[PDB]
Design a protein around this nucleic acid. Structure first.
Lengths: 195, 195
DNA sequence: TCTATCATTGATAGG
DNA sequence: TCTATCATTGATAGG
């Protein structure tokens, strides 16, 4: 019963009780074992949470790299949609992710993304900023959609209808809309530099 | 020694020990009082954290509303910069904010922002989506800048220089750059509808 | 606004 | 991979 099987029952426990009901003792009982034994498998809870973050991405975030011949617009779009989709598969996934320090084992993936931007028109900073903007927006978005989904009158007109809209989707179209907003903003800034 | 003075020593304790060292017992000692007395002033810790969130914004986020005759571009820009600047004044400010449910006492401010968009070209959803995108990006950005600032080799070329860039600013220019990226994306989508 | 007094929870000794 | 055994910490009885 590995550390691999521990990080598994942990992801099941995340989807059950959320990031706060995910307590050492509940995990042990899931693994049929006794509490301080988990300390054999994991350094500590923080270590365990970083584990889950990496695990989620590795497990669902397939589109980390640009396909051959793909436009930056299409990459950024595809990457962000894969990113968000990974976070959304687990309860509190975005929060769990936010706590983790960036993974050293993906240094190569990161650098390839950077290079890809320089080759499609961007200087280094503009590619950095472009990629950063996209993941910041995507993060903020999933965090909110997830906090809205969870949480377990006399609203003014516009607001009333507005909540009804986000309520419809969960935020999907809102997200897809802000994504394109960023890309079009990147296009217009690029053709403004070439100009 | 009010609940007003409690929420004060609490903001001082946030800037000292961060969102995690902010423990009931440390707060009491700051207030020269004994622990369970704080329970007279505050319902519970969550209630206290929402208190701090509202307090931070009320205290620094002045630009919540558009000035008379201001362009949407200028509002969104000014609002986001004020928002981020408020979060940045307190350690873990963005995290503290993220936990809070939206304030009922700002229903009027929200609705005025919505109306302002319909009057400057946007339908309801597009104004909603535009305003949402801006605060999602701003949130994701401050959250990261704050986690990067806190936390208390053989990096590949591009990445090495990239970290050096974000390290220079703390993320400021990165932020200001993504902000304009969103706005220009909004402009181009608006003139694409009128078209 | 103080006094016990808890219950939950992450973690280490110790083998 | 189990046995005490803690220390930190949020919270309620009870007046």
């Amino acid at each position: 019963l590995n550390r691999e099987s521990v990080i598994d029952a942990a992801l099941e426990l995340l989807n059950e009780t959320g990031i706060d009901g995910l307590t050492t003792r509940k995990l042990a009982q899931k693994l049929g074992i006794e509490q301080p034994t988990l300390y054999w498998h994991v350094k500590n809870k923080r270590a365990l949470l970083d584990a889950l973050a990496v695990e989620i991405l590795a497990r669902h975030h397939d589109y980390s790299l640009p396909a051959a011949g793909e436009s930056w617009q299409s990459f950024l779009r595809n990457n962000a949609m894969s990113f968000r989709r990974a976070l959304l598969r687990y309860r509190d996934g975005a929060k769990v992710h936010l706590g983790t320090r960036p993974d050293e084992k993906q240094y190569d993936t990161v650098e390839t993304q950077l290079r890809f931007m320089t080759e499609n028109g961007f200087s280094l900073r503009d590619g950095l900023y472009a990629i950063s903007a996209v993941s910041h927006f995507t993060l903020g978005a999933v965090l909110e959609q997830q906090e809205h989904t969870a949480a377990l009158e006399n609203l003014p007109p516009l607001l009333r209808e507005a909540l009804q809209i986000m309520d419809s989707d969960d935020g999907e179209q809102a997200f897809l809309h802000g994504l394109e907003s960023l890309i079009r903003g990147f296009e217009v800034q690029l053709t403004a530099l070439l100009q």
